Write a protein that binds this ligand. Structure first.
Ligand SMILES: OC[C@H]1O[C@H](OC[C@H]2O[C@H](OC[C@H]3O[C@@H](O)[C@H](O)[C@@H](O)[C@@H]3O)[C@H](O)[C@@H](O)[C@@H]2O)[C@H](O)[C@@H](O)[C@@H]1O
Ligand SMILES: OC[C@H]1O[C@H](OC[C@H]2O[C@H](OC[C@H]3O[C@H](O)[C@H](O)[C@@H](O)[C@@H]3O)[C@H](O)[C@@H](O)[C@@H]2O)[C@H](O)[C@@H](O)[C@@H]1O
Ligand SMILES: [Ca+2]
Ligand SMILES: [Ca+2]
Lengths: 679, 681
């Protein structure tokens, strides 16, 4: 019946209502966080469903406290410490068995449903999941519109009661909305009385992606899963279980960011030997096309292309193509010179003339280079300079087409020494009517990952479902996008709000890292769009947007122009033995310092929102009795993300654990700091 | 503007109506066979579509006459002889280009639409094809209901005007997957006979990268119109120019026998793309099969479990339900039998984990196509078969889970090669997943195509049950050695009405146009374990090895039953499965077929008669035999009192010496037939 966090700060009461509805309640430090909340499911072609009429057949309690070592991460060792309540339910009349399993951590609550092997529930279909989160009042939320096909929205900050009226505008126009009060997870909130509340899920395997629908009379969120192509919300087979649903809570917003709860609820690694999994700093032939300077395509001779018919070797080059042998060489040369691990190349393969908007099945083959891209020479050239290429497999939504070519594509990767692939799923999923985050498409992303692992290939999947901690289980999933990235800074309209990167950690990053592609130095790009950041904001992102996969997205020539600033990007690590969140408020600021794996050096970043601010940090995370050379890369006092983006200062100062530092950060600005011991 | 067959029998007039609608008209021996008939398409989200407002921009004529050698077939050489008219159309306002290409053979008409590379039509979606066949009168038709997911129906014989009223009855239920569309909708191949004695077949050829064509009848004016199969989004073709439709075919003769002889369907398919074809082997086989179909055995190994989960359920530790057919001991019996009687192969079904959930669960991860049940020793059985000069046939039932088959496909074909399986029988029982998809859409059609093409890269032959009905594609991929794609012998074991007695006198004039069927003939025990009565005589069952052409021929009954009737079984052991020549001697759809074939590479002939509801005396000329030579004929016939309902196992066998000048007179019972081997002295 009742359950406590190890530290006694959380209490979860579970009971049944008069009619047999199962309900839960969560309490933090004597405060209601989750009020009485119903659980269970509406099932298709089922009189009675799984909503009510249960009895408690048994309860079982236990405790767990172990550490595991991530392959890559924010810390060298993570603590998995919880108390567990398993409630076995039995429904009257049907005698169907449903377990609700709760784990209560010092960071908050996770729960899931289990269906054991039984006689009167075998194959069933979920019409709707009926999992509630009753809020204590009209909290502030940081939210994106509920959508079955994209998460690439700017966040809105508002009360819960304002979501309805704001939904006309926040839903900017592959996308499918569902409700005027529907929102995605991870969802971040802050109560009128200073509690930070995160609703999300963990271990999204073999199940549809959960969104939340708000009842804005009573402030109750309810699970609203993603329909597949037939409109269903889970083809289930017992014995089976749901992903966990997570309520991470703290009176200190920094603890939300530091939580490993999401990972903790996923199964331990299923990869036995993990040393081939290598955190990666990279450049690429990428932003050129994103910002309208180059094309993915080789030719414009043809209205459409047909692979195996169009003869590319005899087509007129349009001469805008980014992925030329000469251009890739330049990026290789730049990566090698500056200690980067890899270079991504997009537009390398036949088919880019028809990549977007055509709902085209046989859109790519994932193996055949354009005539102007010498796959063999370039891979040899890169390896000779101690660099790798990153394979790119945009699918343009044609999932069957990808699965058929996948083995051959991974083989070709291995044959030329590619160990990582950036995938994509742009456009409607084929065949039309399918959604990007259904149980059905979710299984594709899962299969891609699993198969990549069999080849010892790493995967970074754009346009896929947002992560839910599955990289603990498959640490070859070194990234996704699955949110609005730097690319939108090049797409005109509103680009990304100045405070975007002060919300992403509190939402999107819960579940796993993002390939945000930071590192922009020229904010006014070829197609006229204005990147809403300062240079110092861009340097800070290598620390404030944690990821084992970190791009420097701008052109070689722009880094050359601002070589002094670029030093931080060259110096910063991408893997860590420890991390300390120093300051954080969603929508406003994040400051964090991290200690580079296998070193005694630290790197710090600050990102700042709309309101310019003076940050004051304690350098207590440094080792006692040591001196460090700090180099501080900061906004100039008149820097500004709209009108003065390229104004930064660089200064050196020797510091100790007892030093304090005070730093202006501009509007949409930030700062970065390297700390190296003195010898 | 006008076109003739090489022999002058057919004239095809093409015109445009006052408003620019394209129309065609087909005339046989001065008689209207296809009246003025509209052509073009309704396109989705398009102002104007492709229905009218065309002008003729150009026409082009040509002729073609060459022979090709099939890998397997009814004849050693096939003649491809036609005259061609290509009409380039251009639409007003949009300036879109559409070519209609016509080929006129001595056997009839084929036409298709082509879209060349152009500026104003790239990506488009067909909402409906508007291709008509205006009939000359209220013909007699032999038809099954139009359906997106099964062709497993008994045929009906009726006037066109009677189709609507008969449709409550001909649309029989209890199928795992079936979806009707119209009270006057029918499938192709569709066979007809006019009130005045012409035989008319409507069908298509080269069903590639396009949705399967059905026909909807307007029974006021006797006009059939193309009604294609919707995909999961309701569309009837995601197209990209340059592209083309399959051909639409109107096969006509005043002699029913010429419909059966026509190679027009094959002629309209592209030449073989398999360069080296000698691994492609016509096959006579038995199997662990009918036992399960007739309710004596199971496909499943255990009944301990409500459901099974592959990779979780430990089968090695489950209670055998003890009904499982594909035991090591039982397969060995069929291997022993096959080797003893000169059969090439043995099919085995239920060999692999997952059969406990194979039907009606709409289950994705239903099979893995590689993991044997504990009671089936894959390694030993394959070695035992090869040691006795026999092969196994792999079975890959998918249970509708197409993505699950595609993901396992390479590993499954690899495993075939590792153990010396060179042919696979596939299945698509149950609704295609994910729900909403149909068995004959453009999308699922592409899967069947991919399975065949991939099989070819592995030098594997394919036999696909529940797939789309064939359209001559085996010329291009002769590793497609069969389909079912119609109501086969299995329904003889499924109670209800089983198969009408005249079923096999209609299939050749309908289903067989496009390619062979794995009909699984050869039943000697007509009263089977589950109580169902097979509607045939023994002699009918022998005849089918000749009257139902296929390079893949099963003897579906149990070893026991063939040994019991060993005298009759001789014909099955003797009969060939590939032919240098064939002659249709008599044929009338729904009533009778008699045909003789010459075994490839030999001077031996084999003949079969199958007979419908009415008992009849057949009277044939043996002139197909070589002049001046004597043959031992053995005639396996119905006894006088044989009958498909009440006296199924009564046959006579007599030997007689014959020449090209012999004439034969032979009674065939109701649902009966006769079979004859001719060997030179
Ligand atoms: O691979 C397994 C077999 O699969 C195909 O045929 C199976 C056949 O199953 C169902 O028909 C069975 C039958 O069950 C009776 O009890 C019932 O009265 C009857 O109506 C029902 O149809 C599906 O309905 C059907 O679509 C399917 O064809 C192959 O063709 C077999 O050779 C193969 O062994
Ligand atoms: O694989 C390529 C690309 O795929 C994802 O990007 C998705 C993105 O695609 C569209 O926008 C691309 C945009 O780029 C240039 O600016 C062109 O010049 C434009 O006309 C074109 O729209 C779409 O508009 C977006 O809404 C969509 O999210 C990856 O995330 C990328 O990193 C990758 O390069
Ligand atoms: Ca994107
Ligand atoms: Ca069947």
């Amino acid at each position: 019946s009742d359950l406590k966090s190890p530290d006694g700060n959380f209490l979860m009461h579970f009971s049944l209502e008069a009619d047999g509805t199962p309900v839960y309640k969560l309490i933090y430090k004597g405060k209601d966080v989750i009020k009485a909340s119903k659980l269970g499911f509406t099932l298709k072609n089922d009189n009675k469903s799984l909503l009510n009429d249960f009895k408690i057949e048994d309860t079982k309690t236990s405790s767990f406290d172990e550490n595991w070592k991530p392959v890559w991460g924010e810390v060298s060792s993570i603590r998995n410490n919880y108390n567990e309540l398993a409630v076995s339910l039995s429904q009257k009349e049907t005698d169907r068995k449903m377990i609700i399993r709760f784990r209560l951590f010092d960071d908050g609550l996770g729960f899931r449903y289990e269906f054991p092997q039984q006689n009167n529930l075998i194959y069933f279909t979920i019409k709707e999941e009926r999992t509630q989160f009753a809020m204590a009042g009209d909290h502030t939320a940081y939210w994106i519109p509920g959508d079955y096909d994209t998460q690439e929205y700017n966040y809105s900050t508002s009360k819960l009661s304002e979501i309805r009226g704001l939904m006309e505008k926040a839903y900017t126009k592959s996308q499918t909305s569902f409700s005027p009060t529907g929102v995605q997870t991870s969802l971040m909130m802050k109560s009128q009385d200073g509690l930070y509340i995160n609703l999300h899920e963990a271990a999204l395997i073999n199940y549809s992606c959960m969104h939340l629908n708000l009842d804005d009379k009573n402030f109750v969120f309810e699970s609203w899963l993603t329909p597949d192509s037939h409109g269903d919300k889970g083809k289930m087979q017992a014995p089976c279980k749901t992903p966990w649903r997570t309520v991470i809570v703290s009176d200190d917003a920094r603890n939300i960011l530091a939580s490993k709860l999401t990972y903790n609820l996923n199964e331990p690694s299923k990869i036995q030997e993990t040393s081939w999994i290598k955190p990666t700093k990279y450049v690429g032939v990428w932003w050129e096309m994103i910002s309208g300077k180059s094309t993915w395509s080789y030719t414009d001779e043809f209205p459409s292309v047909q692979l195996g018919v169009t003869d590319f070797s005899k087509a007129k080059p349009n001469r805008k193509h980014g992925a030329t042998t000469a251009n890739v060489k330049r990026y290789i040369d730049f990566a090698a010179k500056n200690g980067f691990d890899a270079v991504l190349v997009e537009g390398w393969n036949e088919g880019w003339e028809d990549w977007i908007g055509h709902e085209k099945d046989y859109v790519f083959d994932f193996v055949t280079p354009y005539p102007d891209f010498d796959i063999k020479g370039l891979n040899e050239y890169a390896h000779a300079k101690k660099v790798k290429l990153i394979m790119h497999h945009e699918t343009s939504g044609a999932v069957r087409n990808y699965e058929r070519h996948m083995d051959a594509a991974y083989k070709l990767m291995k044959q030329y020494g590619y160990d990582a692939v950036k995938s994509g799923y742009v456009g409607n999923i084929l065949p039309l009517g399918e959604t990007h985050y259904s149980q059905w498409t979710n299984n594709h992303y899962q299969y891609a990952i699993e198969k990549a692992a069999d080849y010892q290939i790493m995967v970074n999947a754009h346009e896929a479902v947002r992560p839910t901690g599955i990289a603990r289980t498959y640490p070859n999933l070194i990234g996704n996008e699955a949110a609005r990235g730097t690319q939108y800074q090049a797409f005109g309209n509103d680009r990304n709000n100045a405070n975007h990167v002060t919300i992403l950690p509190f939402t999107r990053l819960i579940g796993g890292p993002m390939d945000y592609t930071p590192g922009i130095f020229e904010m006014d790009v070829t197609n006229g769009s204005h990147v809403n950041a300062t240079i110092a904001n861009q340097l800070a992102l290598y620390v404030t947007m944690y990821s084992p996969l970190q791009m420097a997205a701008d052109f070689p020539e722009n880094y050359e122009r601002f070589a002094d600033a670029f030093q931080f990007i060259k110096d910063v690590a991408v893997d860590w033995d420890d991390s300390r969140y120093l300051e954080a408020e969603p929508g406003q600021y994040i400051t964090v310092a991290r200690k580079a794996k296998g070193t005694d050096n630290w790197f710090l970043g600050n990102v700042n929102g709309e309101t310019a601010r003076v940050s004051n940090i304690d350098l207590g995370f440094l080792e006692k009795g040591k001196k460090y050379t700090a180099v501080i890369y900061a906004d100039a006092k008149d820097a500004n993300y709209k009108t003065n983006t390229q104004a930064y200062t660089i200064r050196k100062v020797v510091v100790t654990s007892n030093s304090k530092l005070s730093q202006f950060s501009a509007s949409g600005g930030g700062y970065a700091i390297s700390f190296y011991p003195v010898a």
